[PDB]
Amino acid sequence: MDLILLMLVAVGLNIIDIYIMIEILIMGCTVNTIYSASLDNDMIGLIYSLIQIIIAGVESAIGLSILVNYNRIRNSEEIE
Amino acid sequence: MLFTSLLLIIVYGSLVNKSHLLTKLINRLGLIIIIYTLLIHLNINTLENLSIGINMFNNLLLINSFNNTIIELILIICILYVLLISFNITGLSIIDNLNYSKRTFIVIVLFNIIGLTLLPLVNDIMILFIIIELQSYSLYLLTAIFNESHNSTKSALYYFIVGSIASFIILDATVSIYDDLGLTNIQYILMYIDKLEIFDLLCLLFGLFIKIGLAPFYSYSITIYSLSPTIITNYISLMPKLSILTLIYIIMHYINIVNNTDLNYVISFLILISMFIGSFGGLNVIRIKTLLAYSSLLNVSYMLLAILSNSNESIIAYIYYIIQYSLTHINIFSIILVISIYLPIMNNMLNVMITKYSPIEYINQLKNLFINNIFIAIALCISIFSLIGIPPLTGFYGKYLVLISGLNNGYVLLSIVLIIASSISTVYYATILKVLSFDTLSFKDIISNNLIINTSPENNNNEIKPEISNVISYVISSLTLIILLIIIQYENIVKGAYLVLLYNWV
Amino acid sequence: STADLYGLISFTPKRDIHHYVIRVDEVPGKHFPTNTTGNFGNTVDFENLEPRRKPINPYL
Amino acid sequence: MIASLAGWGLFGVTVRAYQQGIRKVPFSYYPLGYVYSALGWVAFGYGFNLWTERNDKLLEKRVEKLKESRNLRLS
Amino acid sequence: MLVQNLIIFNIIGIVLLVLLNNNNNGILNKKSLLTIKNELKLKQIGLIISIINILIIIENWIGFNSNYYGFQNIERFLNIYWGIDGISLLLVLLTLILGPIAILSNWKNLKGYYTYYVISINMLVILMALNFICLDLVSFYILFESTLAPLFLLIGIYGANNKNKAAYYVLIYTLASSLFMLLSIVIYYIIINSTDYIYINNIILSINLQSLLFIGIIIGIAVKTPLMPVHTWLPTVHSESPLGGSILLAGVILKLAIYGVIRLLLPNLSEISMMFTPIIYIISILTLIYSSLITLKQTDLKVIIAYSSISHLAVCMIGIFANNLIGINGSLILCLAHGFVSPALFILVGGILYDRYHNRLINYYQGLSTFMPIFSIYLVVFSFCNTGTPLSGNFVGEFLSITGAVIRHPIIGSLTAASVLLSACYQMKLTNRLTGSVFSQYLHITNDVTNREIFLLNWLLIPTIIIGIYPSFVTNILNLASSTLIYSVLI
Amino acid sequence: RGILQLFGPLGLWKLSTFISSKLNKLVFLNIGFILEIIVLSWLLIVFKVSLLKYILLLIIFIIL
Amino acid sequence: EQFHLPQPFWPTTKTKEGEYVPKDSIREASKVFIGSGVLLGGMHFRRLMQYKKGSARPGLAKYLNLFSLSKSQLIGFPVALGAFSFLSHSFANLQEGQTATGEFAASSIASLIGLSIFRTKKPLSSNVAIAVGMGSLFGFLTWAGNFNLGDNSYRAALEAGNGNEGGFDNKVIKTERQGFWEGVYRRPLSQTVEDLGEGRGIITQ
Ligand SMILES: CCCCCCCCCCCCCCCCCC(=O)OC[C@H](COP(=O)(O)OCCN)OC(=O)CCCCCCCCCCCCCCCCC
Ligand SMILES: CCCCCCCCCCCCCCCCCC(=O)OC[C@H](COP(=O)(O)OCCN)OC(=O)CCCCCCCCCCCCCCCCC
Ligand SMILES: CCCCCCCCCCCC(=O)OC[C@H](COP(=O)(O)OCC[N+](C)(C)C)OC(=O)CCCCCCCCCCC
Ligand SMILES: CCCCCCCCCCCC(=O)OC[C@H](COP(=O)(O)OCC[N+](C)(C)C)OC(=O)CCCCCCCCCCC
Ligand SMILES: CCCCCCCCCCCC(=O)OC[C@H](COP(=O)(O)OCC[N+](C)(C)C)OC(=O)CCCCCCCCCCC
Ligand SMILES: CCCCCCCCCCCC(=O)OC[C@H](COP(=O)(O)OCC[N+](C)(C)C)OC(=O)CCCCCCCCCCC
């Protein structure tokens, strides 16, 4: 069911919904890293997992700021 | 030098008052920083010492002669770009003040230069993910530096989403390699190069192919380059390719150890499509930056053929091609920024709107450049004929060396296709030359008192006032003659490329 | 002479999964942050380590 | 080496002369610019000659090992 | 003492013209004296430059040995080796001779920018001349395609109404095809590590690889001679390019394909050239026959001359691919003779009639001998020279090329004799119309051929007659060089 | 003026106009459009390489 | 005595007589036909859901229309690809190997079969011209050696000792024909007679 690109329907029809999809996709990689590190008893993989969480948080902030300013520009006359 | 000086500039810029003059002088400070960085790097890093390859910072980074050459190229090209914002490009306040409006312009560039230089040096999958995001985030900020521009913010929104998906693919590939092997250091992974899924590295390359606008992911790159300001498009369309292509060559160098034929075919398939879209795509377009975006896609495809072959001749071909293409890229965008002073002023059909961010936006805005400035027009013609591949310009030798690597490794189909694509792309390349000069003899006896340059006041009616500032005109003059007169020193330059080794030794 | 020179440089030596360059100069595990002596599965003796493979510098 | 640096200085005069045409000034405008331009590329030419002379030494040393590798292949 | 002096002098010549004309361009609103009389003093300097270029090769000609086998005047310049043999020496002289002739043709018939035109013409003459004295494939290709950039701008700026279409045709036809020749050159540098003329002539490649290399090289050559069916660009370019551009294109550029066969095919791909010879003859014979019949239906005056060059160069391709000395010498003789007669026909059509009436349609002209007797004398004489009438160099070239073709292939090579009839059919039908009947009702009486146009016609006619009556001036130089190209094992 | 123009400047111009018109409609700013193409490229990794020519024929079919 | 014609063909690895186990044309073609139909059919239904997810947003509709296929295309594409897979395998078995002639025939016929389905509202000659064009492209693809020559490249030949690294020697004459990428100083005269034949200057005048 994945090869027919079923996930393209589960994503909503708003720009912020695309942002949510990216966070979920990146979160799946981090969960996989924790899964492998825990089985191996490897703290190096848990270091990688922590880095992925911190880096993904930075990505969300930058993307939101661009989207905030993009919404600001349209409602920017502010004559009142 | 970069990191320490960046912190000082960050604090200093926020302390002094907000003004165009201080921002321009701060931009010159950034120019000195990059120049000092180049001097320090050249003092300690040499080609001979780095031939073996030296690990750094607990083997997280690995520098060799191949990596060092690109870093030196990155610093040099960044110096030429800062000259645009550190000096006048047209001499007119209404046009030039855009570069001096944003104080964080030089700060964001210094952030990206750190990412660009460290990316080819990555030796761990963890630091690979960290650095690729460091470079990607800096590009998003630079694309959105003009936050009062609707197109600039829209492009950055597009850039963020496409790059984030590519970063996820890159992260997904590295995580899958860790699951199979449990190791994060690349050199440790090379011990198991014959026991890991080699198509996981193809997933890694797919993320890198997105970040360089390769087909089928070309569409976002063309849209972003056309909408972004010319001063921003000049950076974001060249700098990411300097570092990512170098990293792709290293990854392909490791992949060729197992020599997976299926891996080569998939990359060949993407190169074949990129040559089709790169050539036929630019045939029917009216924007100059849209035309250059297709030109960028086509030339990256030519370099990828050298990268895919990954042999001794590929090192010579790639190093030469990336250096000469960057110089041609700088020269063309430098001329485009300057020639905005020859635009006629209305004093209407098609209701054409031109903004201050992209004064030159259409190919036909280059009309009568042969009459307006014969030396600048010839400089553009030399650059365009280099992209075509007319010998003995720098462009011909780049394609000549790429063909050598492609045909030596047996890529007969791609070599023939790249030459058909070159002929097809010559059509839109020649269109630029047609606009510049083909109406010279009919418009020689014409009067133009409505040009932008005509609005510039004179000093005393006796001073010989040049139309162009000293710095930008000198850079165009230097780059044009290097492209034209490469035959004089071609033999020695290739000998320098002979000594760039990626673990060849003997 | 020029043809001979280009033949030497342009020749790419064959690489395979049995012969290739790995840039590791030492064996890890001589010191761990804590609990260095684990299940005694580390059989590599650093007191009698044989000489490592050294990288070749063609210019030296 | 003087002839080499003379050529590099000649190239620097060409760059300045080509700059004058770009800026639309007579070629005698500020003649001191040619002195600055020529000495700038003389400095680049001096460094370029050192780069090429150094590269020739490095190439010869590597060629010796390549010939040894070729002899083993041809046997 | 040749390439070094030729390049340095011409580069200094280019700089000299640029400094003088572009000194006062700084929005001076000036008048200046160099621009007086349509920039006479700038055209004169460029004309002097072309004359001096001829003297440069003459100094090396004095030391040329016709009894010495191998390249002479071997010189290293720009990391490239340059040399001269019998075949190269004559082709260089022809290229440099047409320099002043091309400049003098557009002396006072350009709308402006004479300095740009003069520099472009001299640049093209030197670049084409250097292409005959390079000693490797890479250097051959560099000069083979370097002429495209000056020629593309020259046609697009000084061209006729359809100059835009002509500029696209010459740029794309001659580049897309030459790139296939570059592939064969790249293959040589991969498997032999060198593209030197002498080095690659002694190497025998596999019969399959020689077939692939021959096809790649012949595509670039066949488009440039040109041969059917890749010839359609040439009539468009000639009908729209300026007269000086037509002279260089018809007199020099089309001869590079014949010289390309000498250097790139015969001595290095000798085994596959024998196999390809029947195919080359079939293509060239059809090129000769079809072009002559197509010329009978053309209405543009300059297009008719353009198609005539295609038929003659088909004979040159036939002669040069014959495996005997008679065919090879005749092909080289015909190239030299065509290098003078063909520009003269363009001068008569595109330089004399066009500069007065500005219309190239054939329906406007008839009975021109009534008020232009001097024009008709040269038109008739050059028409007979173009048709291969004896006492002209074209007859010597055509007869030996036909004879060499019959020696190479008695059955199908006999068809080359049809050039004697077919060439007279279209050339005389044009000349008979232009001189016969009453003077045209659509033309006003005006000046006959002026002194400047008399000079151009006379000094293009003189070499043709000298070669035609005493071709031993040319044969003696060529005999030793041409004998090396023959491949045969008689036992 | 016939077949050599069909296999020449006139024929290639019509071919170029048809192909370039299709490519002009593929370049527009749309998150859903570029997202599907990126996800579609993942099928190249999944598919066995012997199917590349079938993909190549399929791509040409969509140009029509 | 056949005519002596040039052979501009790149080297290909040959299988001796008795080798080349044939390919099951039906099974290989059925996998492509079924696989293509499920994906094209599956994506069509998925795109219908995207239309129903929202139909008042012009941006989404514009991109969905580009990827949308007509009913004839959803049927024609799997049939054309399935026919291509069958004919390519069937023609390869006849010739004991894959050739550009067989791929030209397989591509042109399969394209014409497909074109007759989803391009019904066009002249037949128009579909023949495209089928010839499509078949020629894949014939050129096979002639060039697919995406890479593989072990028939010069780099592979140079590693195996079949190159020109050792130079050339006129004093050594090899009766057997040299390699594709190998060059020699002097060749046997018998080989020249094989390539060209007696006649216009070989042996006899
Ligand atoms: C002797 C000198 C020879 C020099 C030239 C040699 C090459 C000659 C090429 C001949 C083929 C092109 C000439 C004929 C094409 C004419 C195109 C045309 O007529 O219309 C375009 C056609 C659709 O037809 P339509 O738009 O309706 O026009 C009305 C027709 N009654 O649109 C179509 O249906 C075309 C098919 C769809 C597009 C297919 C594209 C696939 C790739 C084609 C090959 C490109 C290869 C490029 C390689 C480098 C880039 C990878
Ligand atoms: C089943 C999933 C979808 C198929 C995969 C698509 C993605 C991979 C293809 C790579 C190129 C990406 C192009 C962008 C994706 C295409 C999206 C699409 O399908 O849009 C269809 C587009 C518009 O078609 P249109 O008819 O105008 O609109 C239909 C309205 N009823 O029609 C088009 O114009 C799209 C075609 C773009 C041109 C690509 C050409 C690639 C090169 C093919 C020839 C190869 C060149 C070498 C040939 C010789 C090889 C030996
Ligand atoms: C209006 C203007 C129109 C154009 C006019 C052109 C006039 C040319 C001027 C004469 C020049 C001259 O004489 O150059 C000669 C000198 C000295 O050569 P050398 O030191 O022996 O080097 C060896 C030369 N070999 C190999 C031929 C023997 O080389 C130079 O300086 C070269 C100038 C730089 C060319 C650009 C390529 C190198 C870039 C390096 C960084 C990437
Ligand atoms: C040792 C190596 C360096 C060379 C020494 C000189 C350095 C420059 C300082 C001098 C002062 C100056 O540059 O003054 C500025 C001048 C003049 O500009 P203008 O437009 O006439 O100004 C107008 C002033 N009026 C009104 C009086 C006329 O600019 C130049 O001449 C530009 C050339 C820069 C120098 C050459 C650099 C070459 C680098 C290329 C190698 C990669
Ligand atoms: C053999 C090596 C030669 C290389 C260098 C040649 C000179 C380059 C131009 C610099 C000077 C300049 O741009 O000056 C312009 C000159 C002079 O023309 P003008 O009528 O006075 O100019 C108009 C000004 N008016 C109207 C006030 C009088 O015209 C040229 O452009 C001629 C030379 C270029 C011809 C070919 C262009 C494309 C080159 C592509 C290379 C692959
Ligand atoms: C192997 C030998 C190769 C020889 C050369 C190949 C054909 C060259 C055609 C000249 C085109 C030209 O001139 O481009 C200019 C022409 C302009 O057309 P126009 O004349 O104004 O009429 C047409 C315009 N209308 C209808 C308005 C009147 O635009 C084209 O056609 C654009 C497509 C050209 C692509 C060429 C790529 C060739 C690929 C390599 C070979 C497979």
CB A52 within 8 A of CB A30: yes
Q: Is E14 in the pocket of ligand 5 (CB under 6 A)?
A: yes
CB pair distance less than 8 Å for E194 and C10: no
What is the rounded distance in angstroms from the CA atom of residue E398 to the CA atom of residue G176? 43
Atom of ligand 3 nearest to the CA of D13: 9
The kind and range of the H/E element at E489 are strand E489-490
Is beta strand B61-63 parallel, antiparallel or unpaired with respect to B54-56?
antiparallel
Residue B214 CA, ligand 2 centroid: distance in Å: 15
- Using a CB–CB cut-off of 8 Å, the residues of A that contact B are 15, 18-19, 22, 25-26, 29, 32-33, 35-36, 40, 42, 44-45, 47-48, 51-52, 55, 58-59, 62-63, 66-67, 69-70, 73
Q: What is the chain G residue with the closest CA to F25? A: G66
Q: Maximum CA pair distance of chain C?
A: 62
CA-CA distance, B96 to E111, in Å (whole number)?
38
Could you tell me which residues come within 8 angstroms of residue E75 by beta carbon, excluding any fewer than 6 positions away?
E1, E2, E3, E4, E81, E82, E83
Would the CB atoms of E19 and D27 count as touching at under 8 Å?
Answer: yes
Select from B411, B416, B418, B420 the residue whose CB has the most chain G CBs within 10 Å, as the one to mutate to test that interface: B411
Locate B330 and state its tokens.
Answer: 């700088």
Contact at 8 Å (CB) between B118 and B501? no
Facing F4 at nearest CB: one of E165, E168, E232: E232
Task: Return the ligand 2 atom nearest residue G70 CA.
Answer: 31
Element (H, E) at E368: none
**Cα torsion angle, G138, G141, G142, G147, sign:** negative
Tell me whether residues E229 and F5 touch, CB distance under 8 A: no
Residue B448 exposure: Cα atoms within 13 Å on the Cβ side: 19
- Nearest atom, ligand 3, residue D14 CA: 2
Residue of E nearest to G191 (CA): E207
Tell me: cis bond preceding G58? Omega within 30 of 0 counts: no
Q: Tell me, what DSSP letter sits at residue E85?
A: -
| Closest ligand 3 atom to D8 CA | 31
User: For chain A, how long is the longest CA-to-CA vector?
Assistant: 62
Instruction: Spell out which residues of chain E touch residue C2, defining contact as CB-CB under 8 Å.
Output: 193-194
User: What proportions of chain G, in percent to the nearest 5, are helix, strand and coil?
Assistant: 60, 0, 40
Determination technique for this PDB entry?
A: cryo-EM
Resolution in A: 2.8
* CB atoms closer than 10 angstroms to residue E176: 19
From the alpha carbon of D17, which atom of ligand 3 is closest?
1
E24/D27 Cβ within 8 A: no
| Residues E3/E130, Cβ–Cβ less than 8 Å | yes
Length of chain C: 60
Which residue type does B401 have?
A: L
Q: What are phi and psi of G184, to 5 degrees?
A: -130, 160
Q: Phi first, then psi: what are they for B55, rounded to 5°? A: -80, 150
Of all helices (H) and strands (E), which one includes residue B63? strand B61-63
Q: How far apart are CA B236 and CA B89, in angstroms?
A: 19
* Phi, psi torsion values for B283, nearest 5 degrees: -70, -40
Q: Which chains touch D (3 or more CB pairs under 8 A)?
A: B, C, E, G
| Chain G nearest-CA residue for C9 | G165
Asked whether F50 and G77 are in contact (CB, 8 A), the reply is no
Q: Using omega within 30 degrees of 0 as the cis cutoff, is the peptide bond preceding E235 cis?
A: no
Tell me which chain F residue has its CA closest to the CA of residue A22.
F35
Instruction: Quote the ligand 2 centre to B277 CA distance (angstroms).
Output: 10
Phi-psi region of B109 (alpha: psi -120 to 50; beta: other; left: phi over 0): alpha
Beta bridge partners of E416: none
Q: Looking up tokens 């040619």, which residue turns up?
A: D34
**Shortest Cα–Cα distance, C14 to chain G (Å):** 7
Report the pocket of ligand 6 as residue ranges, CB < 6 Å. Answer: B 420, 423-424, 427; E 165, 168-169, 172-173, 176-177, 219, 223, 230; F 8-10, 12-13, 16
Do strands E80-84 and E489-490 pair parallel, antiparallel, or not at all (unpaired)?
unpaired
E337: amino acid identity, one letter: A
Note the ligand closest to the C-alpha atom of B487: 3
Q: Which of E344, E311, E314, E320 lies closest to E97 in space, CA to CA?
A: E344
Those residues with Cβ within 8 angstroms of residue B180's Cβ, 6 or more apart along the chain or in another chain:
B196, B197, B200
Of the partner residues E146, E180, E186, the one whose CB lies closest to the CB of residue B391: E146
Distance of alpha carbon B358 from alpha carbon B337, whole angstroms: 9
DSSP at B41:
H
Strand, helix or coil for residue B428: helix
- Which residues have a Cβ under 8 Å from the Cβ of G58 and sit 6 or more positions away? none
| Ligand 5 probe mutation, E110, E119, E143, most atoms within 8 A of CB | E119
- Comparing C-alpha atoms, which of E323, E188, E190, E193 is closest to residue E264? E188
User: Which residues of chain E does C9 touch, with a Cβ-Cβ cutoff of 8 Å?
Assistant: none
Provide φ and ψ at B279, rounded to 5°.
-85, -60
Q: Identify all chain G residues contacting F57, using CB atoms and an 8 Å cutoff.
A: 80-81, 84, 107, 110-111, 134, 138
Q: If we measure between CA atoms, which residue out of E316, E185, E341, E329 comes closest to residue E258? A: E316
CA–CA separation, E177 and G159 (whole Å): 33
Residue type, A7: M
Question: How distant is the Cα of F40 from the closest Cα of chain B, in angstroms?
Answer: 9
Nearest to E175 by CA among B435, B395, B406, B316: B395
DSSP single-letter state for residue C49: P
Atom in ligand 4 nearest the alpha carbon of residue D23? 20
E168/F9 touch (CB, cutoff 8 Å), yes or no: yes
In this structure, the strands spanning E80-84 and E72-77 are antiparallel
Which ligand has an atom closest to residue D36 CA?
Answer: 4
Residue F46 to residue A3, Cβ atoms within 8 A: yes
Cα separation of E389 and F21, whole Å? 55
Q: Where are the alpha helices (DSSP H) in chain D?
A: 2-23, 32-73
For residue C15, how far is the Cα from the chain centroid? 15
Closest residue of chain C to B498, computed from CA coordinates = C9
Nearest Cα to B197, choosing from B104, B262, B271? B262
Find, in chain E, the residue whose alpha carbon is nearest to that of G179. Answer: E206
Is F7 part of the contact surface with chain G (CB cutoff 8 Å)? no
Tokens coding G29: 């073609």
| E257: nearest Cα among E171, E327, E316, E184 | E316
Contacts with C, D 42-61, CB within 8 Å: 58, 61
